[PDB]
Design an enzyme around this catalytic site. Structure first.
Site, short mmCIF file in Angstrom:
data_model
loop_
_atom_site.label_atom_id
_atom_site.label_comp_id
_atom_site.label_asym_id
_atom_site.label_seq_id
_atom_site.Cartn_x
_atom_site.Cartn_y
_atom_site.Cartn_z
N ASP A 28 0.85 -1.18 0.00
CA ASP A 28 0.00 0.00 0.00
C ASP A 28 0.89 1.24 0.00
O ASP A 28 2.11 1.16 -0.18
CB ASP A 28 -0.97 -0.02 1.19
P1 LIG Z 1 -2.37 4.27 0.98
O1 LIG Z 1 -2.50 4.65 -0.48
O2 LIG Z 1 -2.61 2.81 1.24
O3 LIG Z 1 -3.56 5.02 1.74
C1 LIG Z 1 -3.36 5.43 3.12
C2 LIG Z 1 -4.17 6.69 3.40
C3 LIG Z 1 -3.69 7.33 4.70
C4 LIG Z 1 -3.94 7.68 2.27
C5 LIG Z 1 -5.66 6.40 3.49
O4 LIG Z 1 -6.09 5.93 2.23
C6 LIG Z 1 -6.62 7.48 3.98
O5 LIG Z 1 -6.70 8.54 3.37
N1 LIG Z 1 -7.33 7.22 5.07
C7 LIG Z 1 -8.28 8.14 5.66
C8 LIG Z 1 -7.67 9.47 5.98
C9 LIG Z 1 -6.80 9.37 7.21
O6 LIG Z 1 -6.30 8.30 7.51
N2 LIG Z 1 -6.59 10.46 7.93
C10 LIG Z 1 -5.78 10.50 9.13
C11 LIG Z 1 -4.35 10.18 8.84
S1 LIG Z 1 -3.16 11.44 9.38
C12 LIG Z 1 -2.88 10.87 11.00
O7 LIG Z 1 -3.64 10.14 11.57
C13 LIG Z 1 -1.55 11.21 11.54
C14 LIG Z 1 -1.58 11.16 13.00
C15 LIG Z 1 -0.33 10.54 13.58
C16 LIG Z 1 0.95 11.13 13.09
C17 LIG Z 1 1.16 12.52 13.58
C18 LIG Z 1 2.52 13.05 13.29
C19 LIG Z 1 3.14 13.81 14.42
C20 LIG Z 1 4.51 13.35 14.76
C21 LIG Z 1 5.55 14.35 14.39
C22 LIG Z 1 6.89 14.00 14.89
C23 LIG Z 1 7.96 14.80 14.27
C24 LIG Z 1 9.17 14.74 15.13
C25 LIG Z 1 9.22 13.42 15.84
#
Ligand SMILES: *P(=O)(O)OCC(C)(C)[C@H](O)C(=O)NCCC(=O)NCCSC(=O)CCCCCCCCCCCCC
Ligand SMILES: CCCCCCCCCCCCCCCCCC(=O)OC[C@H](COP(=O)([O-])OCC(O)COP(=O)([O-])OC[C@@H](COC(=O)CCCCCCCCCCCCCCCCC)OC(=O)CCCCCCCCCCCCCCCCC)OC(=O)CCCCCCCCCCCCCCCCC
Ligand SMILES: CCCCCCCCCCCCCCCCCC(=O)OC[C@H](COP(=O)([O-])OCC(O)COP(=O)([O-])OC[C@@H](COC(=O)CCCCCCCCCCCCCCCCC)OC(=O)CCCCCCCCCCCCCCCCC)OC(=O)CCCCCCCCCCCCCCCCC
Ligand SMILES: CCCCCCCCCCCCCCCCCC(=O)OC[C@H](COP(=O)([O-])OCC(O)COP(=O)([O-])OC[C@@H](COC(=O)CCCCCCCCCCCCCCCCC)OC(=O)CCCCCCCCCCCCCCCCC)OC(=O)CCCCCCCCCCCCCCCCC
Ligand SMILES: CCCCCCCCCCCCCCCCCC(=O)OC[C@H](COP(=O)([O-])OCC[N+](C)(C)C)OC(=O)CCCCCCCCCCCCCCCCC
Ligand SMILES: CCCCCCCCCCCCCCCCC[C@@H](O)O[C@H](CO[C@H](O)CCCCCCCCCCCCCCC)COP(=O)(O)OCC[N+](C)(C)C
Ligand SMILES: CCCCCCCC/C=C\CCCCCCCC(=O)OC[C@H](COP(=O)(O)OCCN)OC(=O)CCCCCCC/C=C\CCCCCCCC
Ligand SMILES: CCCCCCCC/C=C\CCCCCCCC(=O)O[C@H](COC(=O)CCCCCCC/C=C/CCCCCCCC)COP(=O)(O)OCCN
Lengths: 99, 174, 128, 459, 178, 52, 87, 69
Positions: free
Chosen positions: G42
């Site tokens: 994926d």
């Molecule tokens: P791939 O093509 O298989 O598809 C995966 C995705 C994610 C594109 C899905 O198809 C999708 O769009 N799903 C629904 C949307 C979604 O998942 N939204 C939420 C995702 S963002 C998220 O949850 C991030 C939160 C955790 C990470 C936060 C980052 C912070 C940390 C920063 C640290 C930097 C210094 C350490």
């Protein structure tokens, strides 16, 4: 349109018609001799000859003369105990103050 | 060479301590001095001997120009252009000579300071007083006359200073 | 949860923290498509001229010409003496002059008064 | 001085009778010969000037300027060769005639012994410059530039003529020697204030002074290369020479009237350097740098101390040479790309190494790198200004910092970086251009070796 | 740099770029490989936990909160590859890149010093000059009446043709020209 | 090849002038925004975001 | 100084990294193996693969180009084109 | 394998440098040789007092032979 005007001509490159061009003229011989006379006269004659002429210009500013006169005056002054530099430039006897 | 006047350019006698080694190790400075004398000093001395022999083949002389004394701006009448010109030229020559005298005294002071080295604040105090006197006299004479200084301006400054001195003396002893 | 980032003039807001980057309307997509179309048209024109084999010279840039003309030769015709312009010009063109005049006049008056009183150290000052 | 004057009046018929393809060669060769002849004027005395006759005399201030003019003529001829390839024979001969007349008028102006003849020639220099600008300029603004230049100069100089004739009627003569020996103090009254204003304002408009300087960018940007070379190097020094000559009869009123002009000149140094920091045109940058340097010379002349006149003369000569070299480099870059925008062409160090070297040397001389005569003059002026007052040091320091900033900024912008991709007409540098830059730069270093020749009569 | 940009970044592209940035900054914080692997596994666990979400509004809100968290917790001095923008070796060799139009200003003696190279250069120049009309015709045939809507160029449809606007892309200077 | 109508001009007052200015600077009419008419000589030049 | 890269070496190194990946079966892995169509990965896995290639070859692949490299052959072609490898 | 290095044409700059060097050394070398020969075989004048009833010339008031000439 507003006038019967010639189009703007393309700029000519001197290196196209003459790869050995010095940039002075489009005629090869004239360009070569212009470069030769400029280089010879300017660099050789002006630079070298004028530089040595200015270097060996006679000391008409009297710097060495002033140094020798200062040495003579210092020797005479300190030999006789007189101050090296006088207090006044002119003579107070000849100067008449208004009173 | 020593083609200059020792009285005009004084120099105290040079006291060099004798070498008294206390160790058996050889002296690298002495060995390098011998090498330098063998490799540099002798060839340059030979070259200078040849050059000076060539110079003595044709020996010619040049002279120091002597300038006569002329009446000065005090004796010059007002609007007398010839006398004013002569006095101005004489004054300018005197000004240049005084500048060179100040230069000579400053050279004395610099040489004395460098020679004395670590004990200059006391040893070369005689040059400091001579330089102070010469500098004060030179400043009083050719003080801020401007870029267009002239014998007339210097005479005016001297007259003003004389008037001030006379007034001070009168108000003191009066 | 976390301290917020406060943008400034010289510390502008990042594109990932812009609130408008997450509230997108269908009109915003149309505007973005129009911007991309304009950029693509300009890029196509530039690339045609740039890859022309017979071109020998400089591809004149109308944007650069407009910028240079506006910054130099277009200022005065579009100037009106508003109160803001009048005050700013008067200040920035006159105030420094009088400030420096006052400073230098005060300094020179103090120095001249000291010289007249004869309490200024002028020894060894024979070069002016 | 006839031994120098007559060869120029012989350059004229030689130019008009030479063949169509030999005009440049003949003019350059004989201009170089005349410069070599004029080198003999450097043998000045220590007390009084060289009085050849009742009309012409040479001084330690006049001699370097005459040498500079006679040396600058052939370089202008080379630049004219560069930019006048397709002109007709008659128009090329007319251009050379204008240059020759300008040089002759400048020589006579520098060697004139009376103030009225000096004024006549110093105003006669306007006609050839105006003709050159308004006839062989490349852009539309040349007419406006010529109008601004001419009217600024004339509005400055007419009260000077009135003051000169009044002075002659009052005193008896305008001969410089007489007005120096027979000089009398100027009382502090309104009439004397206005006479001082007339003379000084004329020479300050010519200088130029900050606030009276827009004609300088207007004329220098729109003039051809030879016109820019003569405008920046020599024609700007007429005001300085006049002020160094006319201030003999303006004392002690100069001690009181110098404040507005001193403040204007120092704040103008600051303002023009700041303007140079943010200029989109290279020629405008060079013109404003010239304005700043001339403002520094104004400060030196106005403070009027023996250490300030030497610095003034040295800075005038050095600035003339440096500005001429900078204008030549900018003209080469312009002729390559046909535009004066500075950020248009980049990577010129990658494309042209030797021109990058010339740019580096010219920019180093511009920012007064020691022991160049630029720095010698600037340092003498700074020391004299420090003796005058102790905040001029602050102003000079910030001016020097900004000067270095904008010089290196223009160097980095033009020469360093990634070359413009779509500019594919950057041909290799010509031997003519390289020789022009070398002939500009070598005399600067030689004068650095021998600096006493350009320190004026107060040395 | 080789791909034409789109009008906008989709939600998947936004979250993938955020994931890559977070992994790179976490690697900058976690210098050692085992620690970096542990915390990268935790980060991908978070992303997979939020992976399945039908509500696009909630997904966008989660993305916004994640971006705020990343900006707060980013490394002040993140690791940058030397040749990447901002790296210590970025644009180092741009001064050594000289083009073929400069190459054709050479003197005949210099060209004679390299005889075999310039024959192939002339062949390339002829090949360029014999295709420009076909390239411009193909470009003007395939454009919409309004004009280009993207910076993507078509390939060569015919066998004897070349992809339009290829000269500078093909003849760009080498990454280590000297 | 630049014509006289391609140079910057006075401040755009009517909406048609604003549209013409936006077309001149190769900008969208919505995205086009000139400097405020304070007499500072900006004219119709667009006020782009202050970013680097 | 450093030895120049070759197409075979680049292919060997990228296949080495892919075979060291634990979510890819080495026996069914080839240069034309699509990461999602026939390898069952994926978007996050593809991003991790791209980052692994970046770490392996010591340079960064921009996200605009990284989102399109779905084959080992595509990755090899991209690396060779960027590094100016023609043999 | 050896790769062609694309450079701008340095032939013209090298030619200008060689021409400038030649034309500076065309008369500079004779000038330096003449100065050396004069300094070696015709030394500087020696300072002497003016003989009684003798009027010298300016070149007799100058020291270096080239300056006197
Ligand atoms: P791939 O093509 O298989 O598809 C995966 C995705 C994610 C594109 C899905 O198809 C999708 O769009 N799903 C629904 C949307 C979604 O998942 N939204 C939420 C995702 S963002 C998220 O949850 C991030 C939160 C955790 C990470 C936060 C980052 C912070 C940390 C920063 C640290 C930097 C210094 C350490
Ligand atoms: C206006 C604001 C103003 O006065 O600014 C002063 C300020 C100078 O600072 P300053 O030293 O404080 O001013 C003089 C002192 O206050 C006082 O100085 P002072 O006490 O030493 O006396 C000197 C004073 C003696 O006073 C007088 O002479 C008063 C009578 C003046 C008569 C009219 C002169 C006409 C010619 C002027 C030049 C025209 C061009 O001299 C002058 O007034 C000379 C005036 C002209 C100076 C030069 C201007 C050049 C052009 C400037 C840019 C123009 C755009 O700026 C100007 O003078 C230029 C203003 C330009 C607008
Ligand atoms: C005199 C030199 C005038 C400039 C160079 C003109 C010729 C030239 O293009 O040379 C490069 C070129 C190098 O060959 P290339 O690799 O083919 O050229 C490619 C690049 O152009 C190669 O360019 P590049 O970038 O590799 O290097 C060229 C070089 C060329 O640039 C320069 O030479 C610039 C020098 C001036 C800097 C700005 C003015 C600052 C004030 C200095 C005043 C000093 C005057 C001293 C007396 C000078 C008398 C002439 O530039 C530099 O080295 C960078 C600037 C270095 C500045 C050093 C520090 C300066 C301030 C401190 C100086 C202190 C001195 C006195 C110490 C007192 C106490 C002991 O030279 C030659 O080919 C020479 C052959 C012909 C020479 C003339 C005839 C000689 C025989 C008679
Ligand atoms: C682009 C770049 C620029 C390109 C060019 C642009 C245009 C340039 C145009 C020319 C501009 C200048 C023209 C005027 C020249 C001028 O005025 O020259 C004045 C001056 C000439 O003196 P003068 O006033 O005419 O003569 C009065 C003297 O009292 C006389 O003293 P003397 O009585 O001892 O005379 C002896 C004689 C001979 O003395 C000797 O032979 C003795 C020396 C060797 C001693 C050791 C010998 C050991 C032998 C061993 C065996 C002995 C056997 C003996 C026999 C045995 C059997 C009998 O000495 C000389 O002839 C002096 C050298 C003359 C050289 C001429 C240089 C100027 C050339 C002008 C044209 C240049 C054109 C371009 C370049 C062309 C190629 C150069 O020039 C020199 O002295 C040469 C340059 C300075 C050298 C000084 C000595 C070295 C000092 C080193 C100091 C280092 C300080 C620290 C530095 C580093 C800091 C980090
Ligand atoms: C550049 C164009 C110049 C055009 C005009 C050229 C005029 C040349 C006239 C002939 C030369 C006369 C020289 C002096 C002769 C000796 C007697 C004398 O007066 O000595 C005075 C003084 C002092 O002489 P003195 O009178 O004290 O006695 C010296 C001792 N005896 C008597 C033996 C001469 O100088 C000399 O004697 C030394 C002269 C050195 C000459 C060489 C240095 C200068 C080099 C110049 C090179 C430029 C080209 C020169 C071409 C001609 C060369 C000859
Ligand atoms: C190699 C790198 C160069 C760049 C970096 C510089 C690093 C230092 C390089 C130093 C090289 C020179 C060192 C040796 C110098 C020897 C020559 C020097 O000693 O003579 C000088 C003399 O040089 C010349 O005077 C310079 C001439 C300058 C004028 C040339 C004008 C040419 C025409 C151009 C007109 C331009 C008009 C500009 C306005 C005038 C100084 O005068 P002086 O030592 O005491 O003369 C001795 C003769 N005496 C004893 C009888 C007095
Ligand atoms: C500028 C605006 C102000 C100047 C307008 C010029 C109109 C003249 C106004 C000033 C006139 C001054 C004057 O006439 O007297 C000066 C005096 C008269 O005294 P007398 O009567 O002869 O004897 C003493 C009597 N007890 O005569 C002189 O000193 C000769 C010189 C006076 C010339 C007039 C001065 C002109 C003012 C110079 C300013 C220059 C400005 C330059 C403009 C630059 C523009 C870019
Ligand atoms: C008490 C501590 C002071 C510290 C000073 C700090 C710097 C502040 C002073 C300078 C700031 C600028 C003030 C002057 C500029 C005028 C402001 C202005 O432009 O206002 C105009 C309208 O004009 C005014 O409002 C005038 C109000 C201020 C007038 C001040 C008194 C006028 C002074 C007369 C003297 C002028 C000459 C001064 C120099 C003479 C020589 C020294 C419209 O403003 P907008 O930008 O369109 O709207 C923005 C709203 N925030």
């Amino acid at each position: 349109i507003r006038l019967q005007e010639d189009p703007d001509p393309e700029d000519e490159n001197l290196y196209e018609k003459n790869p050995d061009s010095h940039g002075y003229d489009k005629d090869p011989i004239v360009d070569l001799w212009n470069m030769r006379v400029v280089f010879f006269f300017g660099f050789s004659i002006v630079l070298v000859l004028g530089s040595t002429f200015v270097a060996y210009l006679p000391d008409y500013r009297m710097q060495e003369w002033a140094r020798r006169e200062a040495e003579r005056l210092v020797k005479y002054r300190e030999a006789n105990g007189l101050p090296l530099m006088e207090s006044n430039c002119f003579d107070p006897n000849k100067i008449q103050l208004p009173e | 060479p020593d083609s200059w006047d020792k009285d005009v350019y004084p120099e105290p006698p040079r006291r060099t301590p004798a070498p008294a080694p206390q160790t058996s190790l050889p002296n690298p400075v002495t060995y390098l001095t011998k090498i330098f004398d063998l490799l540099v000093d002798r060839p340059v001395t030979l070259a200078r001997e040849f050059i000076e022999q060539q110079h003595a083949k044709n020996r010619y002389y040049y002279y120091h120009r002597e300038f006569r004394r002329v009446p000065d701006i005090t004796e010059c009448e007002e609007k007398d252009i010839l006398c004013m010109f002569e006095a101005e030229m004489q004054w300018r020559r005197d000004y240049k000579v005084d500048q060179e005298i100040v230069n000579i005294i400053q050279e004395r002071l610099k040489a004395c300071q460098q020679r004395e080295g670590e004990s200059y604040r006391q040893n070369c105090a005689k040059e400091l007083e001579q330089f102070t006197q010469v500098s004060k006299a030179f400043q009083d004479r050719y003080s801020d006359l401007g870029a267009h200084y002239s014998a007339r301006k210097c005479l005016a400054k001297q007259k003003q200073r004389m008037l001030a001195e006379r007034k001070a003396a009168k108000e003191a002893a009066a | 949860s976390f301290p917020k980032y406060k943008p400034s003039r010289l510390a502008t807001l990042p594109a990932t923290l812009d609130p408008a980057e997450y509230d997108i309307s269908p009109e915003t997509r149309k505007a973005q498509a129009e911007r991309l179309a304009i950029r693509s048209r300009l890029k196509r024109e530039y690339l045609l001229q740039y890859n022309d084999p017979n071109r020998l010279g400089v591809i004149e840039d109308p944007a650069l010409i407009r910028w240079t003309y506006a910054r130099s030769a277009n200022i005065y015709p579009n100037f009106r003496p508003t109160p803001k312009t009048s005050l700013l010009g008067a200040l920035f063109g006159i105030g420094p002059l009088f400030f420096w005049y006052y400073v230098f006049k005060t300094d020179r008056d103090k120095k001249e008064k000291l010289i007249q009183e004869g309490k200024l150290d002028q020894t060894f000052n024979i070069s002016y | 001085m006839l031994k120098i004057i007559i060869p120029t009046t012989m350059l004229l018929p030689m130019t008009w009778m030479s063949k169509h393809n030999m005009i440049w060669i003949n003019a350059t060769v004989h201009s170089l010969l005349i410069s070599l002849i004029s080198l003999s004027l450097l043998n000045q005395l220590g007390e009084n000037s060289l009085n050849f006759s009742l009309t012409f005399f040479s001084d330690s201030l006049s001699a370097p300027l005459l040498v500079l003019t006679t040396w600058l003529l052939p370089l202008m001829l080379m630049a004219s060769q560069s930019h006048l390839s397709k002109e007709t024979t008659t128009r090329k001969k007319l251009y050379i005639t204008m240059l020759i007349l300008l040089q002759l008028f400048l020589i006579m102006t520098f060697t004139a012994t009376e103030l009225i003849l000096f004024y006549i020639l110093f105003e006669a220099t306007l006609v050839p410059t105006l003709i050159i600008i308004t006839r062989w300029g490349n852009q539309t603004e040349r007419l406006n530039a010529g109008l601004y230049f001419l009217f600024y100069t004339l509005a400055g100089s007419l009260p000077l003529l009135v003051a000169l004739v009044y002075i002659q009627n009052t005193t008896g003569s305008l001969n410089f020697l007489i007005i120096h020996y027979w000089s009398h103090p100027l009382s502090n009254s309104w009439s004397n204030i206005f006479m001082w204003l007339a003379c000084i304002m004329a020479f300050m408009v010519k200088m130029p002074l900050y606030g009276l300087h827009l004609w300088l960018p207007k004329a220098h940007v729109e003039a051809p290369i030879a016109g820019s070379m003569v405008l920046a190097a020599v024609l700007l020094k007429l005001g300085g020479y006049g002020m160094m000559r006319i201030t003999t009869i303006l004392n002690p009123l100069t001690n009181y009237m110098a404040y507005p002009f001193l403040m204007l000149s120092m704040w103008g140094m600051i303002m023009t350097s700041s303007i140079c920091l943010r200029q989109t045109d290279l020629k405008s940058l060079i013109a404003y740098s010239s304005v700043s340097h001339m403002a520094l010379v104004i400060v030196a002349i106005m403070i009027q101390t023996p250490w300030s006149f030497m610095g003034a003369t040295a800075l005038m000569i050095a600035h003339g040479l440096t500005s001429s070299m900078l204008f030549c480099l900018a003209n080469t870059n312009y002729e390559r790309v046909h535009s004066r925008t500075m950020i248009l062409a980049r990577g010129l160090q990658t494309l042209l190494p030797l021109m990058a070297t010339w740019w580096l040397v010219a920019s180093l001389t511009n920012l007064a790198l020691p022991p160049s005569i630029n720095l010698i003059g600037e340092l003498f002026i700074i020391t004299a200004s420090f003796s005058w007052s102790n905040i001029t040091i602050i102003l000079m320091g910030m001016n020097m910092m900004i000067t270095a900033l904008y010089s290196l900024y223009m160097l980095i912008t033009t020469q360093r970086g990634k070359y413009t991709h779509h500019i594919n007409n950057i041909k290799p540098s010509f031997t003519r251009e390289n020789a022009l830059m070398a002939l500009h730069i070598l005399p600067l270093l030689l004068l650095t070796l021998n600096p006493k020749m350009i320190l004026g009569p107060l040395y | 740099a080789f791909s034409a940009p789109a009008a906008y970044l989709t939600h998947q592209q936004k979250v993938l770029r955020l994931y890559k940035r977070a992994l790179r900054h976490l690697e900058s914080w976690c210098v050692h490989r085992d620690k970096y692997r542990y915390f990268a596994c935790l980060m991908r666990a978070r992303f997979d936990e939020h992976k399945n979400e039908k509500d696009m509004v909630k997904a966008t809100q989660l993305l916004r909160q994640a971006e705020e968290e990343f900006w707060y917790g980013q490394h002040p001095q993140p690791y940058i590859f030397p040749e990447s923008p901002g790296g210590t070796s970025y644009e180092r060799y741009e001064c050594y890149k000289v083009p073929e139009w400069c190459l054709d200003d050479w003197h005949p003696s210099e060209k004679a010093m390299y005889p075999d190279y310039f024959a192939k250069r002339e062949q390339w120049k002829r090949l360029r000059r014999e295709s420009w009309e076909r390239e411009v015709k193909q470009l003007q045939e395939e454009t919409p009446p309004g004009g280009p809507r993207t910076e993507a160029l078509p390939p060569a449809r015919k066998e004897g043709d070349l992809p339009p606007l290829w000269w500078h892309i093909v003849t760009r200077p080498r990454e280590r020209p000297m | 090849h630049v014509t006289k109508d391609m140079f910057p001009g006075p401040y755009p007052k009517t909406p048609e002038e604003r549209a013409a200015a936006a077309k001149k600077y190769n900008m969208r009419v919505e995205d086009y925004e000139p400097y405020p008419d304070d007499g500072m000589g900006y004219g119709d030049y667009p006020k782009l975001p202050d970013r680097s | 100084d450093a030895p120049p890269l070759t197409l075979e070496a680049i292919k060997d190194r990228v296949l080495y990294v892919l075979k060291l990946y634990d979510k890819i079966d080495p026996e069914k892995l080839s240069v034309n193996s699509h990461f999602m169509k026939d390898l069952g990965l994926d978007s996050l896995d593809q991003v991790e693969i791209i980052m692994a290639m970046e770490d392996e070859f010591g340079f960064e692949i921009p996200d605009i180009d990284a989102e399109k490299l779905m084959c080992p052959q595509e990755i090899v072609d991209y690396i060779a084109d960027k590094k100016d490898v023609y043999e | 394998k050896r790769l062609f290095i694309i450079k701008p044409s340095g032939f013209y700059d090298r030619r200008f440098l060689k021409l400038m060097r030649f034309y500076i050394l065309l008369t500079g070398i004779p000038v330096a040789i003449g100065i050396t020969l004069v300094n070696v075989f015709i030394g500087e004048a020696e300072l002497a007092d003016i003989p009684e009833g003798y009027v010298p010339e300016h070149w007799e008031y100058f020291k270096h032979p080239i300056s006197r000439w």
